[PDB]
Symmetry: D2
Subunit: 428 residues, 4 copies
């Protein structure tokens, strides 16, 4: 199937082919003068993939309000149809990340739809940070770390079910992010809550297939506003080290305290073999969940610099799961995910241009200026031509968003799906 | 009428009266040794009021979920009923802040219910940060500063309607907080957006009664995650100054950048006569909206220290509007508001204890250690006895939350209200 | 006696009546709450915190230093001044030394301490500044420097610190370094940390059987882009890697904005790697201000975690307590006195928490009453308890007022020549 | 010429070929985008930023200072090194002086500047440290000190800075003071500000008709609790109160974590009080790192506001641009060279933004395309433009490469005695 007509894609590509050939050739000549083979770079970029969040193709909101657009997806099936568009145009998001119970449905159908749309399934995501209809025990005061045994058992069961769904659809990991924490000093005993959490996670670990991974995701705050059980990478490391070989840490960019050196955390986790994966997005204030690289592109580049460095030195058993975790409140969710996936490949491609030998030399000589300039030479490079050519050669669009708007997809699905209504957030 | 049975109040007060007498007399003797008449302090404390937010009486939530408790208020009237309890027990929250359209209802009935419950109404709160049913233009991309004139006009009209409702119930002010801002660089032109906002606010100011005040509330971020039109007190000052004498700035404690010295902002606004009022709450990370003083009680004291100093310096015509703006996500909203109102009176009382003459002397002599110790001598003082006696003398409860739970009020409204 | 005993007695007697009234009033109030004030006073009078030799002299910033009068000339003057703090507060019996700043004949240092009634806490190494005759500069690092010879030099300095500490009665070595980078790319994060670990392993080998090696994390300064030992996570990795004798030291002002520090303390305790504390306060960065002068509640919450550990029955839990502050606009002696007092204050209030009631509220998820239970302790003015603890142990009811009445500062100002160049 | 002309020419010819290729390639791409590269280049070669005299020497922190070789001592050595930056970049024709650090016979300074081809930007007063023989200490403040005589002394000092500046070609005085408090209660926020305003009014009276008075806000350091001129809000009140000749100076690293600085820039421009900038980068506090070395996009976004201000033809808009950095681990000259380069880079890129398209996407609320319009400009590698601009104006294609090829550092190292061999 092709959510976007092939003629429109070919049409929009031909319209930009000339300019692209020029830019690509100019960049290739420049890279050559730098001892770099543009073709080698493009080949790797075509092979870089990042999972899209099923809950990301829908318009998001804040605790104050939600302003849905037209053609909002009704459920997992409409969401998969929209994710297909993203993959077809960018060719960078072949896999979708499911969230339960939001995307609960017959595993056979999900798999079927995915195969038909040319989409796979990444890590499963459990939900014990909200109450579902008919739920026996509320997660108001926590889940996996709740003081009530029955409540923890219920949370554990839910996570085990997520693993069962994932196995049936082709997933190989479970990501566990909970809101568990406290809003007031004294409300929670830090140590006892963590102990409860560890014990519950141990039960979940027991249900992991031999080739599966369990990712725990830390977050400084929100929904808890005083303390959070899994508040940072330090606690997260203790979790992973304690649970076992299959347990690793997931780093969501906007989940750190102000001014935190996030790329260092990535490096530390790689060093001790616990970098399970990433949740890409950008931010300026808190866990803003904005389009990747829209606020601080250099920081995104620096994270990838650590990723490529580890890749370069053959760090064996190094396959971090890459996923986008964003909320789109003022843009067409599909266009944002498209450009976000693009930005990620942009940062990856620039990281690949880093002269590793020269950098190592300046590091050993303590030539700070040249070391930092060596990274900038790669970062300053406009690799858009490589990103565009990679898409073109793999069946994607030179200009993804332009082709998307030219296709009229949004207007189309807007006519097929029921209207939505604005409203307030959880504030009241 | 009394939401809490008068016999329960008398009972729970008698049960703690002996202990209170002992603590009050001990504190009075200690203060007397420090040259302070405890009676003068209690007299002032029982006169300190802070308005309760109608939107804080029901359980709050986040973008991730809402976990309502039992007996949740069904509307503004249930909310007023619950606010009546807060006032009856603490005697520090005689006024309620309404939010339109959330609390829209016959103004005449609101006033009636208010008078019967012994409650009054503080500043009105406009809402152009969310869309209402049948709304012609969406506020998705802004409201008062939206690029579309028709949208801006609609936002202006809404605020004017808020003023009409407030005039009917006895409100004397309009508080304007909007989410207007951008999530991406370039999305908005900082200056043009601000110019649009100023022009729209000028229209609202034009329709403001001459016995009313117009409060603009700054916020660093959320719902906007890259830029916000009214992002800080600097922009807020420019707004108030531009609009006119009736326009002032409202300071919400959790709306500042990390590590910001908020008590200084308060002092600066007072000096330039633009401190319209406060939205009290506490926080640790962002605009957490937690129970006031639950996280950083000293900071609360330091804010009140600037308020009391303003009086001591002789600043005139200074009557800030005091209001609580909190979200109660994991506690009984009534209990949180009760203890929050209490914490605010606590900080106020301690600020009244500061030996101003001594402090002044240490400041002039640059004796930093004794100057800070002078503030600490006041802050370290446990004024709970003064707060409890104040409540007792004015019809409240020695221990509000204890009396509240003894009343079984929550179970009662839980039975009267749906699930 | 640094401070004349008649001065202390006179000042104590002047305030005796008021202390009696306040203490007995507090005692009755606590009794009504089921707490024995005498039991609290008995524990308070035994809570000690080490005073930093480097904080007895006036501090400064990169912009300027404004010395006061009678600045101590060397380590001996500093010990003399520390003796004043201990005599008046009775809460600072031990001094933390810094090498090479306080380098001197161990026997002389020991003798002076004994004569003044002072002991010595953990030693502190210095490889964040260059000393004269140094073969290699620490400009680009020390224990993690790319140059092997530079690292070896840093290792030998730490071993020397241990030798000095052993001779004077110390039982630990605290290691804080500025190692890090100011530009992206300057350092390879993983290799720099590996170099550090290798060097610390060597230092670890020189530790006596009853010693401890404390590593201190810091988010930034002097490094402004990355720091090798940047946070508690990296710190935990260090202690766990080095061995049983290695633990983490938590300096309150070394964390990112809004960090929940008390949780970090709880985590380290759970995994037995909480070596000790560097107490101070701050509002912006590593401000190094007088403990509790900015956020007294936070200080109380850290102690709440320390007391809960004891309540939970954590075994062999003896964290080292030290003050690490810089006094740029006050008399250092007066600030250290009141800071030590704030520390005992927070400790005393933490002892007042009704743990039985708290555990009940935590189990029932009664967040409001749980927090109020903490507040009922924190709101209690324990000054009378601190004052009585001092009176009973030979200290001053009001330390700073007594210090000022003694005229000590004016005395040492006349005895000590201020530096000219 | 500090750098031999044959060296400059040689290093240029070595890179001339590749540059021609890149400049032509960028010119074609820009043409396809409706942009004339020549128009950009013409503006870029005219963009200047003043170099801080206190920036050519190696910097340090409160913990240590690690000087490099050939450290410039005195204003004459410093002007000599600044000349190198100007010769190679052609973007720093003016130097910012700091009194009393750079005190010297005005006529001799003017003479040295003209000989080196350097002018002088805003004068910088210093009342955040004490000079020998000073009558009153600034320990507790200067312009806002509680002591009248101390304020008068500070005021007189600034006036002297204006006299020195008038004699050498300066047209502005920048005032940054450390004035503030480290403890709650220490200062009365309002009285301190009142005193500051009164003193600044006296300085303002000494300003010639064509002079400007810049006040610089700073959140913290040296004051760690409160600072009189803590932010742009207070700064605006100052400028508005003093008069038309008074404006606000924005130092990028003086803001609270996560602050939207470009918005502050826009607000000040709207109200005619954006006096100038102090460029530098940072990640934690006022790190004073090489401009754009940490967050180059933020720098671009600041220049986006600057370029748009001109595009709108705002009145009273003519900001002074200065670099205010500290180089603790690099050759100061090289850092200043590359920092000045980054500033021009951001400027060039902001010049590339399609204002018409941007304005269109803003009106339609097409946030995605709006931000992409900024990115299209930002993602554009303008190095070819910067290099050509330098080549056409007598500068070096690759400034740092040419600097190293000249062996200048080793040269001054042989002429200037270090403290130790
Ligand atoms: C929906 C998803 O579980 C969620 O975004 C988490 O991954 C975490 O980012 C929350 O802050
Ligand atoms: C509900 C109320 O309008 C709201 O809380 C505003 O005042 C502001 O605090 C929001 O962040
Ligand atoms: C002097 C002492 O080594 C130093 O203060 C360290 O302990 C650490 O606090 C530095 O920021
Ligand atoms: C040296 C110069 O006066 C100084 O850097 C000020 O401009 C300010 O940036 C300090 O933090
Ligand atoms: Mn996530
Ligand atoms: Mn998140
Ligand atoms: Mn508010
Ligand atoms: Mn708010
Ligand atoms: Mn320390
Ligand atoms: Mn420190
Ligand atoms: Mn500056
Ligand atoms: Mn600065």
């Amino acid at each position: 199937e092709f959510r976007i007509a092939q003629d429109v894609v070919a049409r929009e590509n031909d319209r930009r082919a000339s300019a692209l050939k020029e830019d690509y050739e100019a960049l290739g000549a420049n890279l050559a003068r730098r001892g770099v083979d543009i073709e080698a770079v493009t080949a790797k970029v075509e092979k870089f993939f990042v999972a899209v969040p099923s809950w990301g193709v829908g318009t998001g909101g804040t605790r104050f309000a939600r302003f849905p657009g037209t053609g909002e997806p009704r459920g997992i099936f409409d969401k998969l149809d929209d994710c297909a568009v993203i993959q077809q145009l960018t060719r960078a998001t072949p896999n979708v990340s499911l969230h339960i119970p939001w995307d609960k449905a017959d595993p056979k159908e999900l798999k079927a739809r995915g195969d038909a749309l040319g989409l796979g399934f990444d890590a499963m995501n459990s939900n014990t940070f909200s109450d579902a209809p008919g739920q026996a025990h509320s997660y108001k005061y926590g889940s996996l770390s709740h003081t009530n045994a029955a409540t923890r058992a219920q949370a554990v069961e839910h996570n085990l079910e997520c693993i069962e769904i994932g196995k049936a659809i082709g997933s190989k990991a479970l990501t566990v992010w909970i809101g568990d924490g406290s809003n007031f000093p004294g409300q929670s005993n830090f140590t006892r809550a963590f102990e409860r959490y560890l014990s519950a996670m141990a039960e979940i670990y027991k249900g992991l297939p031999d080739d599966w991974k369990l990712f725990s995701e830390h977050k400084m705050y929100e929904p808890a506003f005083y303390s959070t059980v899994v508040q940072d990478w330090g606690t997260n490391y203790l979790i992973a080290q304690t649970l076992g070989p299959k347990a690793q840490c997931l780093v969501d960019l906007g989940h750190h305290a102000p001014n935190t050196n996030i790329e260092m955390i990535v490096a530390r986790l790689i060093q001790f073999g616990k970098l399970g994966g990433f949740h890409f997005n950008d931010s300026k204030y808190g866990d803003d969940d904005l389009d990747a690289g829209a606020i601080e592109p250099y920081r995104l580049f620096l994270v990838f610099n650590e990723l490529v460095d580890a890749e370069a030195r053959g760090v064996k058993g190094f396959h971090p799961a890459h996923m986008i975790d964003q909320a789109h409140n003022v843009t067409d969710p599909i266009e944002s995910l498209i450009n976000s996936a693009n930005e990620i490949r942009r940062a990856y491609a620039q990281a690949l241009l880093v002269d590793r030998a020269a950098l190592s030399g300046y590091q050993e000589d303590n030539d700070a200026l040249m070391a930092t300039e060596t990274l900038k030479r790669a970062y300053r490079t406009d690799v858009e031509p490589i990103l565009a050519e990679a898409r073109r050669r793999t069946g994607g669009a030179v200009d993804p968003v332009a082709t998307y708007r030219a296709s009229g997809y949004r207007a189309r699905v807007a006519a097929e799906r029921p209207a939505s209504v604005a409203g307030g957030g959880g504030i009241i």
